[PDB]
Amino acid sequence: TTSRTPATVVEKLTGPDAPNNTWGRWDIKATDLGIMWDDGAGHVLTAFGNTFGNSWTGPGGGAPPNGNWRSNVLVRSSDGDLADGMLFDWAAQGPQGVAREIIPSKKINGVEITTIPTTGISVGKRQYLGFMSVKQWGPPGVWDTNFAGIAYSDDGGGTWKVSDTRWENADGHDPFQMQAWVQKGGTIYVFGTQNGRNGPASVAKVPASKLLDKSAFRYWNGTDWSRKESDAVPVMDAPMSEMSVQYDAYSKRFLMMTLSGEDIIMRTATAPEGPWTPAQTVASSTDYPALYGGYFHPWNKDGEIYFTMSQWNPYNVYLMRLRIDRDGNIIDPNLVTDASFERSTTLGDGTNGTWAAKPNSGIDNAPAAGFTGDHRAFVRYNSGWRDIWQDVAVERGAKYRLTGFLRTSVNSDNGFFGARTLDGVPIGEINFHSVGAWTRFTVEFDAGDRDAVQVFGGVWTNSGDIWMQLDDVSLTKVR
Amino acid sequence: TTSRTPATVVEKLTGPDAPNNTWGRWDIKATDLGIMWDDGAGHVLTAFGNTFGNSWTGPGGGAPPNGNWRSNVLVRSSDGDLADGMLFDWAAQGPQGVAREIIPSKKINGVEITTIPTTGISVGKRQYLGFMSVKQWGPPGVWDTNFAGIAYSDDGGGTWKVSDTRWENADGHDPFQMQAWVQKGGTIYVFGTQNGRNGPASVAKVPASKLLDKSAFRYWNGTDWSRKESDAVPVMDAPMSEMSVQYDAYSKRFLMMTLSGEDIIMRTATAPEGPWTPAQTVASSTDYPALYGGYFHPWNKDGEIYFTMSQWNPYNVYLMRLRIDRDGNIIDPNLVTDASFERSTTLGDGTNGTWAAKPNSGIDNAPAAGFTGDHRAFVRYNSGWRDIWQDVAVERGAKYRLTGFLRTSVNSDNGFFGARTLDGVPIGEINFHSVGAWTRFTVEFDAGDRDAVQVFGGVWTNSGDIWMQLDDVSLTKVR
Ligand SMILES: CC1(C)O[C@@H]2O[C@H](CO[C@H]3O[C@H](CO[C@H]4O[C@H](CO[C@H]5O[C@H](CO)[C@@H](O)[C@@H]5O)[C@@H](O)[C@@H]4O)[C@@H](O)[C@@H]3O)[C@@H](O)[C@@H]2O1
Ligand SMILES: CC1(C)O[C@@H]2O[C@H](CO[C@H]3O[C@H](CO[C@H]4O[C@H](CO[C@H]5O[C@H](CO)[C@@H](O)[C@@H]5O)[C@@H](O)[C@@H]4O)[C@@H](O)[C@@H]3O)[C@@H](O)[C@@H]2O1
Ligand SMILES: OC[C@H]1O[C@H](OC[C@H]2O[C@H](OC[C@H]3O[C@H](OC[C@H]4O[C@H](O)[C@@H](O)[C@@H]4O)[C@@H](O)[C@@H]3O)[C@@H](O)[C@@H]2O)[C@@H](O)[C@@H]1O
Ligand SMILES: [Ca+2]
Ligand SMILES: [Ca+2]
Ligand code: NA
Ligand code: NA
């Protein structure tokens, strides 16, 4: 939809330009999902779906025959400072220097083409990773699974076995093919969808210590929790996709994220069986085309909600953030209009929620041309100060955080990114020189005694033919 | 010298192709030294000299006018697993996304062209960083300093102040311009050289809590520790350079590392004042041209000696390792001859400590063409198995660790790195596909009942015009 996107892009976690350098360290050049859980020992484990190495070019998933296709890979983080990204400090390797597939697949189309992680959790000293055995793929949002399964590891994710526990997909409509686990107290709630993205979500619950025992599951049947899976009823209507569910102590609500139709949405509930509050836009397909996934970071707290988002054309995973109040309502949204430049192929005059720029400037538009999406802004010249800017309404006296991703021609020597008055006087800014990789810059400032500022990025071009590119600009209130 | 290099390259820590991606994270594209210390709070702080960003090309230090020249930068590590590299987890930034200069300099040639870190330590909750004020550079190994200073930080390296404590260099021959600190008991021993690389080392000591108080220093004069800096006599003869000293609990010895003439060497002592045992070669200029630095990692233990080494042409810092026994003798040296391919410009026949390869192959030779140095081996064809190999003498029944750095053309699909019998039967190997960045591969194997193996790397080349490059191959006994 054209709904506004409250969420902010924090970092590209995987693939080209990613700070993490998954490509260099582990031959993770392109991948998706980024399903996260707390390993019970001070770390976050993060699992990915179909992963490709050095020869991948994109756009999209898929690679040449030498693409080092693994159905899945796993990395670890110990990073508690998510505002500045999420550093991966380890990966399951084999050989060393290459992230290995941890849940094997046959890679025979129409039998089992791949095995894709869905959700993860730890109980005591055991890690568990839910997955789906994919028989074959159809058009977007459509695929067939053989079963949902569970792998486990007793050494923090170093080595894995596949358990015998499965939800078989007898008739293609089994409701627990694609799962999402949340633990509260001594109980794991297991949400499930059918294969693909056109069906509803169901829920079951199991004592945390009995996750591998299907007979210990009880299924919400609309009145109570019963033994038969075939009694399960939907708790959230179709259409729903891959899902993530987190218990947020701050708001005393379960939060659920999913791609529903076009957009990633969030709903909230005081109990897993519902009632689930109406969908709130997290990210729209207009701002983040061919987005999918959406998995909560397990160290979210205090109303700060970090999550991983996938996107088809760049075929890589981004860390995202949004904020909620104590009722689970999204607050302090990105106030920048058209933050990812995806909504227009030209510039405006900088007013009324449009971007402006000096000559020579425009929107580059091609598959995965953006930092995210297919669009980015540019400005280029060979004389004087050359910038890109947008007027943004603000609350006088409030403090703001401005983040954005930019890069320059190698011969760039002086650029700035920041906020200024509508008269052009800088309020807060930083100074960059030559920027190779897409790089996030971050500026926090007081809006002061005014109802609007101009967010901007630009380069001095006195020294030569110099360009800057820009994407995914966010202005959000600081609390 | 042409002496053999016992040390093994572990990882490139900074710059292009480094796993750490200091370039993308922090605009640390090229830099030197990598002076390390324990910050007292479970981390290693690492300081660097003159640092350049995105526009740097090399070879060597210096950059274009937009090269984001900083006199120094500082990163952090929490990494206890040095066998697979040293992950940096933070850098002192400003703006965020750019590692900043932490010790200012005037950058006026003949006054103060730069400020270079020399050594660091923590005492309680304070970090200290020694540095030299550089007035002007001369030819290699020669420069003039104004003084040695000490900067300090009370917030774990986040912010820095330059103290008023200085060793001034009125006549150019002050013996403590370039310091190396080591703490044992509550005493810091302060080793010192003149400016540049042609003089001897002296030693001073100070109670750890009084590092900033020059009146608390005592200076070894050959008979006792006295109050006057002018009484200090050499404890180690010229020529010596930048230095590192570590107290090794394993050997109950102080270890000293420095570039002495052409080679990085190590000496040992049971007391800081000496006597210092004769120089042992760590890395020779023949294998590692224009090497310098050599700083011990503070978490060295059990005889495993990790250290950082700089090298001019790639102008970046590498983690290295060697092993000692309980007497402080280097043991278990790299058994591969001409490990970095620098000693010859053409291939041999694989015997007598030479490299061989199948057509089309040779030694690439250009400034900073190596992973390290100017040389790397290459093999390239479009048919069959195409490899680079060397016969290496082994001890029957012993276990060995083979590491080496390689990369491939993007269209590579299947290569192997490992050890095999002289008759070509693999003993242990790994399988790689397409390798973009220089990447280290690691193989451990039993030599079994034989006293030679062939170490190799190669690519299958049926799928196209495929090449592999290879550098810094090491085979060392496992303990
Ligand atoms: C055919 C396909 C999907 O499977 C093969 O395996 C590789 C990719 O695998 C990753 O993709 C799976 C998810 O696939 C769904 O998501 C795609 C993108 O969705 C976004 O774009 C569409 C179009 O508007 C919207 O649905 C959404 O916003 C969609 O096309 C797929 O149905 C993961 O499970 C797996 O890890 C490729 O080599 C190849 O692609
Ligand atoms: C002029 C110089 C050195 O300083 C300017 O700032 C940048 C580089 O600075 C780093 O260089 C210093 C060390 O410089 C010495 O090391 C060089 C390399 O040594 C190897 O080559 C020679 C000959 O084989 C041997 O001494 C050794 O094996 C040598 O030329 C220098 O004297 C660090 O303190 C500093 O951070 C450049 O822009 C420029 O270079
Ligand atoms: O890949 C990086 C970006 O390149 C593409 O840039 C598109 C822009 O390039 C042209 O503008 C740059 C062009 O203008 C400047 O020179 C202009 C000359 O015109 C007058 O005669 C003189 O004042 C001046 O010398 C110089 O910087 C260069 O030649 C323009 O066609 C377009 O807007 C982007 O798509 C990428 O992001
Ligand atoms: Ca975009
Ligand atoms: Ca070399
Ligand atoms: Na972080
Ligand atoms: Na490591």
Residue numbers in the entry:
A (entry chain A), B (entry chain B): 2 to 480
Can you quote the paper on this entry?
In this study, we identified four enzymes (two GH183 endo-d-arabinanases, GH172 exo-α-d-arabinofuranosidase, and GH116 exo-β-d-arabinofuranosidase) from Microbacterium arabinogalactanolyticum. These enzymes completely degraded the complex d-arabinan core structure of lipoarabinomannan and arabinogalactan in a concerted manner. Furthermore, through biochemical characterization using synthetic substrates and X-ray crystallography, we elucidated the mechanisms of substrate recognition and anomer-retaining hydrolysis for the α- and β-d-arabinofuranosidic bonds in both endo- and exo-mode reactions. We propose a d-arabinan-degrading pathway for Mi. arabinogalactanolyticum based on its gene cluster and four characterized enzymes.
A complex-form crystal was prepared using a catalytic residue mutant (D51N) for the co-crystallization of A9LT. In the catalytic domain, the active site on the front side of a 5-bladed β-propeller fold contained a linear tetrasaccharide with an acetonide tag (A4LT). Unexpectedly, a linear tetrasaccharide without the tag (A4L) bound to a putative carbohydrate-binding module (CBM) domain that adopted a β-sandwich fold was revealed. The bound A4LT molecule in the complex crystal form spans subsites −3 to +1, and the arabinofuranose ring at subsite −1 adopts a 3E conformation to hold the α-anomeric scissile bond in the pseudoaxial position. The side-chain oxygen of Asp33 is located 2.8 Å from the anomeric C1 atom, making it suitable for in-line nucleophilic attack. Asn51(Asp) forms a hydrogen bond with the glycosidic bond oxygen between subsites −1 and +1, suggesting that it is the catalytic acid/base residue. Pro141, Arg198, and Leu292 form hydrogen bonds with A4LT, while Tyr293 and Trp138 form stacking interactions above and below the cleft. Glu243 is the third Asp/Glu residue in the active site cleft and supports the side chain position of Arg198, which plays a pivotal role in holding sugars at subsites −3 and −2. The activity of the D33N, D51N, E243A, and E243Q mutants toward A22BβT was nearly abolished, confirming that all three Asp/Glu residues are catalytically essential. The arabinose unit at subsite A is sandwiched between the aromatic side chains of Phe379 and Trp468, and hydrogen bonds from Asp365, Arg381, and Gln470 are formed.
